[PDB]
Amino acid sequence: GPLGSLVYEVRQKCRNIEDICISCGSLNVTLEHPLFVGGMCQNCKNCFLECAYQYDDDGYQSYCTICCGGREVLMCGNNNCCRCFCVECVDLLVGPGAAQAAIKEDPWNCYMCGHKGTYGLLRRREDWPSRLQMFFA
């Protein structure tokens, strides 16, 4: 859906991030993203559950941790992690240029592994691990 302009409104403080699907931009929010503050639609949940921990022949997750898709992605360098974040989600949810800042960062701990927990509009849930296991059954 039209995520860019919805996030624009979130940034203007005239829409709540928890009332949009941060995975596709759908307004039909019936649940919560299990990793980050923000809504999620049923389509996106069905995709996550479907492309759950699929891996490419490079040893990394095939799809973006946020939107379960992505064209060009950033890869985490933290062993037991192997997650990917696409440049489109990063630039939209973290902020314009953050992806290139993170590519320049050497090495790079991804937003799932960082200590900080908040990165622009992208906010990690304190209870993500409980929420995540619950997500998968």
Binding site: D56, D58, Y60, S62, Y63, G69, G70, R71, E72, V73, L74, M75, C76, G77, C84, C86, V87, A102, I103, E105, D106, P107, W108, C110
Partner: peptide, 8 residues
């Protein structure tokens, strides 16, 4: 961070 393109 290293990058890759995906398999769309």
């Amino acid at each position: 961070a290293r990058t890759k393109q995906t398999a769309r």
